[PDB]
Subunit: 102 residues, 3 copies
């Protein structure tokens, strides 16, 4: 499995999370409100967002990335994949994540 992250404006965040799960694109999404500060075209932006932390099979990462790009309201969406130590993780959990990612 791997973990992927995106930041979304708050309303879109909850809606898109639900859709990724309903479509079995991801097994689980954890949503955290965040304050994001970032550079964009010579401006410093300070925004209310929500972080989606998405748990998905390794094989399903491409499908997630494509669906995120279809749904994401931003011209340049965040999509960052974090490496999981699959051996050290609980094997029954990684299998669950694999099984729910259709």
């Amino acid at each position: 499995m791997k973990i992927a992250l995106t930041n979304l404006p708050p309303e879109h965040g909850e809606r898109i999370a639900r859709l990724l799960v309903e479509e079995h694109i991801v097994a689980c999404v954890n949503l955290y409100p965040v304050h994001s500060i970032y550079s964009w075209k010579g401006e410093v932006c300070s925004e209310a967002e929500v972080t989606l932390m998405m748990k998905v099979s390794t094989q399903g990462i491409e499908r997630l990335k494509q669906r995120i790009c279809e749904l994401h309201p931003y011209e340049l969406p965040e999509f960052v994949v974090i490496e999981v130590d699959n051996n050290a993780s609980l094997r029954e959990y990684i299998d669950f994540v694999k099984g729910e990612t259709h």
Copy 2:
């Protein structure tokens, strides 16, 4: 060192985080409240949880895993280990983590 994550109901998250630190199974736990949406046995579940981000020596990961499974209320607990770049991380911090984690 590595980082391990689990989600727990808020009734248990704070208690278990404390116990892991008191028993020197982990050096440090960060707790974040979270809304979790997940697929379970044909249903979409929407729950209040707390995420434990646990910092532990690489060698102590197995002991952590075992203790999480003993304590976790869920039939299928989340236990996901994230890869740390030990070279790029601050060595003094990695050594702190290692020193607080007791191996047996």
Copy 3:
């Protein structure tokens, strides 16, 4: 790119995050309040902190680490780098992060 994490007291977290972005030492920081429980010199400590999740180019990681050590108010600052799968991540996003991180 990589992701780096540090925890700061809330009276410094927002200030440092803003500085790191203004100076182009990172492209983006996400800030999350956290409850930290940790082991320190035989005591269990329970603190209010803020986690900074910093997105930075791979080549700017060293400069970030140094800047964090200059600014951090703890005697032993946290700085943990988590491994990003750059190929699986969105290429346009990783290019954005690279472009907004200035080494010089």
